[PDB]
């Protein structure tokens, strides 16, 4: 009777990830969902290798919008190219709400939880991934008898400490009384690192192209006028600056917003702009000539 | 069928999707994986969002014999709309390492699907190149002015990227390198300069042996390359012009601003010289008292 | 192992040759600890109240902590007091608890089997964690003395290496493999290397990580090429992170003390695309040049750390420094003052470990001061390391011999008392508390002996295994090999009393 | 030609600033006065 529940972590590959993000953004604010194709290995590795949508439904997250019916169609299509694997759970998109599981999401998850004990549920916020961050969390329900027995400590075996939440109060109400969340790591290859990085062709055309100088004259013009104003703000501060506690001087004789540092900043950021202009210029004189 | 073609922008997802698809069919070791390629077309820039594998067999003694499951594709397209109902057929990817002469016959079969002339997107699976490790071609049928009949032949389209907000941030999210092939600090752009100079050196050298090979390897007189080669010579720089003198007078200008900006820094650093000395002056008294 | 044979054919008295095996020598140390040990039974109660046996992380801390305190004599006071508390845990925490018995009953060779026998297979079938974790704990008792024991444990492994095992068998075989590492340490048994090579080839998930570790412990300081080749390649064969990691850090043990003939390996491991092989490559430098402050070794470790953006790797490279600079522990606080200055958590974690290992002997006021705000940092993983490092540094000094000993002791206690802190912090103070009181305050860590001014092999081996505790808790028990008892034992040279 | 020279003249004063600024600082911080 019973199978143990312990810390896992869901490795979402780059390939997989980009499809959830792309699909979710387009279809939002309507919830899009679909199943996740992958592998289960060892008991700390949920490996999600590929994903694909299940048709967009107005009912949102539901066993009605998945069905074994549509999934069998999708499977036979993947089967013939020999890319079929084993289904590791399901994903869904909240329309702008943080990652937690609803009562209906949990009930979808319970249908799957009978079928594989390690099956995971993944909330994507593709409308929170307009940041630098990517907001996606995965959860897994803990059995009815165990929560009552307080086997919450059981769930913290086989990690060394990496816990950090991105939400509380909706996240933290479901977490104590239903589910235990899993952390997500991201997997890449070294080929992918180059593709991700290059969003330009200007890495062998950046020594033979640059900006026109009319804009450089706009920027250099603006820079000098500014440094005169900041030099006055900076002279005003150093009327004194021998009275103890830096902070008090900055309020009284305005040194707020650190004009000393501010003038330095404008000097650095324009000084680098010109070194580029030169490096493109000199490459042209000597290569061509 | 539209001829509407200028460029190819490529989602990062495509490159990666096709890299795995090649190794999971397990048509590799000089055996090709050929799949369908999905995206928007009927616009100048062909916008490639996604790709899928197709069951494919490659006779390696004869690349002019292959297996393609025509039925399957129709099945697959219905599933592509679920994902995104702007995905329609736009071509098929090839897994490199480059263009072949067995590709025209494969291209034929892909005309029963696409409303645009079938794209051939070479996804290099080894990552060779000095830009994006993709070439793009499209098959266009055109008369030849040399005296021979109408051929179907592959003209290159440039390779480029553009990306969705979700995809672009995901890229950075996965990635963790600070990148010497894009701009950044001064040192980072110094790496880009040296490379660009060497990039001109590598490519100009390639034209020298290509002109020689037409008359010493008996490649044919291809008028389309050489007309562009002539327009390089017309737009090429000169010397001793008042245009080239104005450049020198602009060198004076910008360096002077840099000169003054440098001198401006030095003022600031000499004040921090002086502040620390005020910090030194206090520390003298404390040393005496103890 | 070979020297005694030569002396046998010179002709000697059999007394000397027992002493060279070391069995008498263990007995003399046993007696010192039986008589003079002073343990804190109110502390045993206090940890028990603060940290729960039904809370699996909390139960690990208390099991480890008491075991180090009670170490060096077979005393059953921990078992009887906490007789209902031990059973409440399960999974690998209850595995840790069974092997903490063998930390307390370390040594006592004649009686080693007697105190472990209610746990050992043949009358244990109730739990698979007990069955395997008693064999691990039996390995600690007989570590470096277990030549006969090697045979007995080997029957069990050969049985299980022809199978892929049940989950009953995997846990059982797990602790057999760490244990036989200990018993057959520094023996150069190619019989054992072959024995464990069969387990690696099963691809069993937790049994294979353990197999790799056990191979490294037996073949310590051999620099054998066959063994090196197999483990390094099996990393690519698997996708398991646990297993891949187990080979990487065991390869460090194998190249102990050859220094630039460990170089070919370092090149392979550092150039590897894998992060795990970079994690282990750092440890290969550490053991190879251990106890020698050569400029070259330390240079490479410093560079690897800053320039990488792999969290596991940054931590490992900085820990490795400490081993290389045991020779001159005067310099460590100045060199790693830099690294604690950089406010990255993993980096700060390895820096506390660098201070702790390097300076584990005589106390330094500075070493203490640099660690002190690192018990205050917001990241809780630094807080764990900082207090454990202070406990390694001041192991049995008096509070009239440096008055910071009593203060720092209360600082660990204060975190535990508090229940408003994080469990990571209460875990850090409690494990550190047992290290601080270790031996009953009779032993100290002897990195380099002053008896001849020479490096100690046992002290180095325990500490590198101990730094894996963050990735597998059972391995904490290896710190017992870094405890070497400090006493003058006078002996009558005519019948040995 | 001229602007180049002034720029290098500035660079030289920067360097002298660096070595001198920290050497007396270093004596005080080492020295006990606490």
Swiss-Prot record, chain A:
SUPFAM superfamilies: JAB1/MPN domain
Keywords per UniProt: Acetylation, Hydrolase, Metal-binding, Metalloprotease, Protease, Proteasome, Thiol protease, Ubl conjugation pathway, Zinc
Pfam families per UniProt: JAB, RPN11_C
Changes after translation: N-acetylated by NAT3.
E.C. no: 3.4.19.12
Disulfide partners: none
Gene3D superfamilies associated with the record: Cytidine Deaminase, domain 2 (3.40.140.10)
Example of a GO biological process term: proteasome-mediated ubiquitin-dependent protein catabolic process
Domain MPN: residue ranges: 10-145
GO MF annotation: an example: metallopeptidase activity
Catalyzed chemical reaction(s): Thiol-dependent hydrolysis of ester, thioester, amide, peptide and isopeptide bonds formed by the C-terminal Gly of ubiquitin (a 76-residue protein attached to proteins as an intracellular targeting signal)
Binding positions for Zn(2+) per the UniProt entry: 92, 94, 105
Domain notes for this protein: The JAMM motif is required for the deubiquitination and degradation of ubiquitinated substrates.
Note: Present with 16400 molecules/cell in log phase SD medium.
Subunit comment: Component of the lid subcomplex of the 19S proteasome regulatory particle complex (also named PA700 complex). The 26S proteasome consists of a 20S proteasome core and two 19S regulatory subunits. Interacts directly with RPN8 and STS1.
Annotated PANTHER family: EUKARYOTIC TRANSLATION INITIATION FACTOR 3 -RELATED
Reported function: Component of the lid subcomplex of the 26S proteasome, a multiprotein complex involved in the ATP-dependent degradation of ubiquitinated proteins. RPN11 is the only catalytically active member of the lid and serves as the essential deubiquitinase of the proteasome.
UniProtKB/Swiss-Prot annotation, chain B:
GO MF assignments: metallopeptidase activity
Any GO CC annotation of this UniProt entry: proteasome complex
Keyword Chloroplast set for record: no
Keyword Phosphoprotein: yes
Swiss-Prot/TrEMBL GO biological process terms: proteasome-mediated ubiquitin-dependent protein catabolic process; ubiquitin-dependent protein catabolic process
Domain MPN: 8-143
Residues with the N-acetylserine modification: 2
Keywords on record: Acetylation, Phosphoprotein, Proteasome
Recorded superkingdom: Eukaryota
UniProt modification remark: N-acetylated by NAT1.
Other facts noted in the record for this chain: Present with 19800 molecules/cell in log phase SD medium.
Family: Belongs to the peptidase M67A family.
Protein name according to UniProt: 26S proteasome regulatory subunit RPN8
Species name: Saccharomyces cerevisiae (strain ATCC 204508 / S288c)
From Swiss-Prot, chain C:
Other facts: Present with 4750 molecules/cell in log phase SD medium.
Mod. after translation: N-acetylated by NAT1.
Gene Ontology CC terms, in alphabetical order: nucleus; proteasome complex; proteasome regulatory particle, base subcomplex; proteasome storage granule
The entry's keywords: Acetylation, Phosphoprotein, Proteasome, Repeat
Residues of the full protein shown: 271 to 767 of 945
Source organism of the structure: Saccharomyces cerevisiae (strain ATCC 204508 / S288c)
Positions of PC repeats: 96-129, 133-170, 175-209, 210-244, 246-279, 280-315, 316-348, 350-384, 385-422, 428-464
Protein family: Belongs to the proteasome subunit S1 family.
Presence of the UniProt keyword Flavoprotein in the record: no
GO molecular function, one term: ubiquitin protein ligase binding
Function: Acts as a regulatory subunit of the 26S proteasome which is involved in the ATP-dependent degradation of ubiquitinated proteins.
Name this protein carries in UniProt: 26S proteasome regulatory subunit RPN2
Disulfide pairings: none
Superkingdom, taxonomy of origin: Eukaryota
GO biological process, one term: ubiquitin-dependent protein catabolic process
Quaternary structure, from the entry: Interacts with UBR1.
Keyword Phosphoprotein: yes
From Swiss-Prot, chain D:
PTM: N-acetylated by NAT1.
Basic and acidic residues bias (residue ranges): 22-34
Domain of life, per lineage: Eukaryota
Reported function: Acts as a regulatory subunit of the 26S proteasome which is involved in the ATP-dependent degradation of ubiquitinated proteins.
The family this protein is said to belong to: Belongs to the proteasome subunit S3 family.
Subunit structure: The 26S proteasome is composed of a core protease, known as the 20S proteasome, capped at one or both ends by the 19S regulatory complex (RC). The RC is composed of at least 18 different subunits in two subcomplexes, the base and the lid, which form the portions proximal and distal to the 20S proteolytic core, respectively.
Any further remark recorded for this protein: Present with 16700 molecules/cell in log phase SD medium.
The name this protein goes by in its record: 26S proteasome regulatory subunit RPN3
Natural source organism: Saccharomyces cerevisiae (strain ATCC 204508 / S288c)
Lineage: Eukaryota, Fungi, Dikarya, Ascomycota, Saccharomycotina
Gene behind this protein: RPN3
Parent-record interval covered: 459 to 492 of 523
């Amino acid at each position: 009777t019973g199978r143990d529940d312990t810390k896992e972590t869901v490795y979402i590959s780059s390939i997989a990830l980009l499809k959830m993000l792309k699909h979710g953004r387009a279809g939002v604010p309507m919830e899009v969902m679909g199943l996740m194709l992958g592998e289960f290995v060892d008991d700390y590795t949920v490996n999600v290798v590929d994903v694909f949508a299940m048709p967009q439904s107005g009912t949102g997250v539901s066993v009605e919008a998945v069905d074994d019916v549509f999934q069998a169609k999708m499977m036979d299509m993947l089967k013939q190219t020999g890319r079929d694997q084993m289904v590791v759970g399901w994903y869904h998109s909240h329309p702008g709400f943080g990652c937690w599981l609803s009562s209906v999401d949990v009930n979808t998850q319970k249908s799957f939880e009978q079928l594989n004990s390690r099956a995971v549920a993944v909330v994507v916020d593709p409308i929170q991934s307009v940041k630098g961050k990517v907001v996606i969390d995965a959860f897994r329900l803990i059995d009815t008898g165990a929560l009552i027995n307080n086997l919450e400590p059981r769930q913290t075996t086989s990690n060394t400490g990496l816990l950090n939440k991105a939400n509380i109060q909706a996240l933290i109400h479901g977490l104590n009384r239903h589910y235990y969340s899993l952390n997500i790591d991201y997997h890449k290859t070294a080929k992918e690192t180059k593709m991700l990085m290059n969003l330009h062709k200007e890495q062998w055309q950046s020594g033979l192209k640059m900006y026109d100088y009319e804009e450089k004259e706009e920027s250099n013009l603006a820079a000098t006028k500014s440094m005169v104003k900041i030099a006055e703000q900076y002279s005003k501060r150093i009327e004194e600056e021998k009275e103890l506690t830096e902070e008090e001087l900055k309020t009284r004789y305005v040194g707020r917003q650190d004009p000393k540092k501010h003038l330095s900043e404008t000097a650095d950021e324009t000084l680098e702009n010109n070194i580029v202009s030169v490096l493109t210029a000199g490459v042209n004189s000597v290569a061509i000539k | 069928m539209s001829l509407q073609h200028e460029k190819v922008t490529i989602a990062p997802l495509v490159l990666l999707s096709a890299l795995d698809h090649y190794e999971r069919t397990q048509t590799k070791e000089n055996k090709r994986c050929v799949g369908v390629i999905l995206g928007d077309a009927n616009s100048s820039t062909i916008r490639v969002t996604n790709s899928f594998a197709l069951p494919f067999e490659e006779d390696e003694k004869n690349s002019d014999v292959w297996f393609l499951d025509h039925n399957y594709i129709e099945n697959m397209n219905e599933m592509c709309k679920k994902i995104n109902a702007k995905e329609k057929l736009i071509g098929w990817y090839h897994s490199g390492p480059k263009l072949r002469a067995s590709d025209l016959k494969i291209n034929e079969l892909f005309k029963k699907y696409t409303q645009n002339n079938p794209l051939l997107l070479i996804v290099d699976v080894k990552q060779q190149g000095v830009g994006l490790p993709t070439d793009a071609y499209v098959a266009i049928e055109q008369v030849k002015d040399d005296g021979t009949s109408t051929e179907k032949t592959f003209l290159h389209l440039p390779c480029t990227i553009e990306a969705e907000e979700a995809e672009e941030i995901g890229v950075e999210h996965l990635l963790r390198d600070v990148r010497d092939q894009a701009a950044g600090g001064l040192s980072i752009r110094l790496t880009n300069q040296l490379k660009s100079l060497k990039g001109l050196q590598s490519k100009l050298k390639d034209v020298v042996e290509y002109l020689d090979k037409v008359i010493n390897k008996e490649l044919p007189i291809n008028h389309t390359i050489l007309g562009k080669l002539q327009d390089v010579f017309n737009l090429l720089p000169n010397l001793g012009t008042p245009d080239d003198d104005e450049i020198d007078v602009e060198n004076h200008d910008r360096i002077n601003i840099s000169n003054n900006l440098q001198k401006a820094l030095t003022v600031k650093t000499n004040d921090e010289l002086m502040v620390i000395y005020i910090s030194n002056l206090v520390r003298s008294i404390i040393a005496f008292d103890d | 192992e070979i020297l005694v044979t030569e002396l046998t054919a010179q002709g000697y008295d059999p007394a000397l040759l027992n002493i060279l095996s070391g069995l008498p020598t263990c007995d003399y140390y046993n007696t010192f600890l039986l008589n003079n040990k002073n343990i804190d039974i109110g502390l045993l109660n206090k940890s028990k109240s603060s940290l729960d046996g039904k809370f699996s992380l909390f139960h690990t801390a208390v099991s480890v902590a008491n075991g180090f305190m009670h170490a060096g004599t077979t005393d059953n006071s921990f078992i009887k007091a906490n007789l209902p508390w031990l059973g409440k845990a399960q999974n690998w925490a209850k595995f840790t608890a069974t092997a903490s018995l063998g930390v307390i009953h370390k040594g006592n060779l004649l009686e080693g089997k007697k105190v472990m026998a209610p746990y050992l297979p043949g009358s244990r079938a109730s739990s698979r964690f007990i069955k395997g974790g008693s064999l691990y704990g039996l390995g600690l008792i007989y570590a470096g003395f277990g030549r006969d024991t090697t045979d007995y444990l080997k029957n069990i492994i050969v049985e299980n290496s022809g199978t892929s095992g049940d989950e009953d068998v995997d846990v059982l075989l797990h602790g057999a493999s760490l244990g036989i590492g200990l018993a057959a340490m520094g023996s150069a048994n190619i019989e054992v290397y072959e024995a464990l090579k069969e387990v690696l080839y099963n691809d069993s998930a937790t049994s294979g990580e353990a197999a790799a570790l056990g191979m490294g412990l037996c073949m310590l300081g051999t620099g054998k090429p066959e063994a090196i080749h197999d483990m390094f390649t099996y990393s690519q064969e698997t996708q398991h992170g646990n297993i891949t990691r187990g080979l990487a850090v065991g390869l460090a043990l194998i190249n102990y003390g050859r220094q630039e003939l460990a170089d070919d390996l370092i090149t392979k491991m550092l150039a590897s695309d894998e992060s795990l092989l970079r994690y282990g490559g750092a440890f290969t430098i550490a053991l190879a040049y251990a106890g020698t402050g050569n400029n070259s070794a330390v240079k490479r470790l410093l560079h690897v750390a800053v320039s990488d953006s792999n969290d596991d790797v940054r931590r490992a490279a900085v820990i490795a420094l400490g081993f290389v600079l045991l020779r001159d522990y005067t310099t460590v606080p100045r060199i790693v003052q830099l690294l604690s200055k950089s406010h990255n958590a993993h980096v700060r974690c390895g820096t506390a470990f660098a201070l702790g290992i390097a300076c584990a002997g005589k106390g330094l006021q500075s070493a203490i001061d640099v660690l002190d705000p690192l018990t205050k940092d917001p990241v809780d993983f630094v807080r764990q390391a900082a207090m454990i490092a202070l406990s390694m540094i001041l192991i049995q000094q008096t509070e009239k011999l440096n008055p910071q000993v009593a203060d720092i002791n209360k600082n660990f206690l204060s975190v535990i008392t508090n229940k408003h802190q994080e469990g990571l912090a209460k875990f850090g103070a409690c494990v550190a508390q047992g290290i601080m009181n270790a031996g009953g305050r009779n032993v100290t860590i002897q990195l380099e002996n002053a008896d001849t001014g020479t490096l100690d092999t046992k002290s180095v081996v325990g500490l590198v295994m101990f730094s894996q505790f963050w990735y597998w808790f059972p391995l904490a028990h290896f710190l017992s090999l870094s405890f070497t008892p400090t006493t003058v034992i006078g002996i009558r040279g005519s019948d040995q009393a | 030609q001229v602007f180049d020279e002034r720029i290098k003249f500035a660079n030289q004063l920067h360097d002298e600033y660096l070595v001198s600024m920290r050497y007396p600082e270093d004596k005080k911080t080492q020295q006990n006065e606490k």
